[PDB]
Subunit: 73 residues, 6 copies
């Protein structure tokens, strides 16, 4: 048995851009109010209040080339 | 048995950009107000209040090449 | 058995950029107020209050080349 | 000639209030951009740019009693 | 001629208030950007740029009694 | 001729207040940028740039009693 695994890649993954900007992200600009009385919890509580986990991601490129090669006998 | 694993790669991942800027992220600009009375918890509590875990990510490139190779006999 | 594992890489991961700047991250700009009465906790409590874990990441490149190789016997 | 000018005032001008608050005034929160080329002015120029003359007035009373009395012969 | 200018005042101008507060005035939160080329002015220029003349006025009373009296023979 | 000018005042101008506080005035929080080329001025220039003449006035009373009396013959 002879196996030749000989792929060739000459690709380009390319961006060209002018100025990138004037970006506004303002999550949770409003009043948040929580009132709680007489609650019973008999098991675990996870609580998040306000403005959490928000992302502003502004890459000047942001290109992805994701590639996978496999052989098995 | 002959196995000849010779993948070849010449690929470019590229960006060209103007100015990158004037980016505003303002999460949780509003009043957050929590009032709690007479609560009972019989098990674990995790609480997060206010502005948490927020990200501003502004890379001048941010390009990714991700490349995986395997063989198994 | 003959195994020749001879992968070849000539890639580049590249960015070019103008000025990178004028980036504002202002998490938790609002008043945060927490009022608690008569709470009972019978197991572990984790509390985070205010402005925590927020990130501002502004790399002049920020490119990633991630590569993985395996052979098995 | 007899002139008797004898007004009597027993009035009250009254306010009663709870808490007064949580007031937000945010004029000119957005980007202001002015580009001018080759303008000729042959007379006087007054220019105002940005956020000017804004008022936030929050009196705990703010009552007015304004009164005028006159006699003439 | 007999003139008797005998006005009487027993008035009150009154406020009662709770707590007065949590007042936010944020004029000119946005970017101001002025670009000028080749302008000619043959007469006087007044220029104001940015955040000017803004007032926050929070008196715990702020009540006014204004009163004018006149006689003329 | 007899003139009796005998005005009588027993008035009060009054305020009562709770706590007075938590007042924020933040004029000109944004970037101010001015770029000028080849400008000609042939008469007087007044220029104000940045954050000017802004007032924060928070008197615990701030009441006014203004009164004027005049007689003429």
């Amino acid at each position: 048995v002879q196996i030749v695994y000989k792929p060739v890649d000459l690709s380009k993954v390319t961006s060209k851009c002018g100025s990138l900007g004037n970006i506004h992200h303002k999550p949770g600009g409003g009043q948040v109010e929580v009132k709680s009385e007489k609650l019973d919890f008999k098991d675990r509580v996870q609580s998040k209040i306000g403005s959490l986990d928000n992302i502003t991601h502004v890459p000047g490129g942001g290109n992805k080339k994701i590639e996978t090669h496999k052989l098995t006998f």
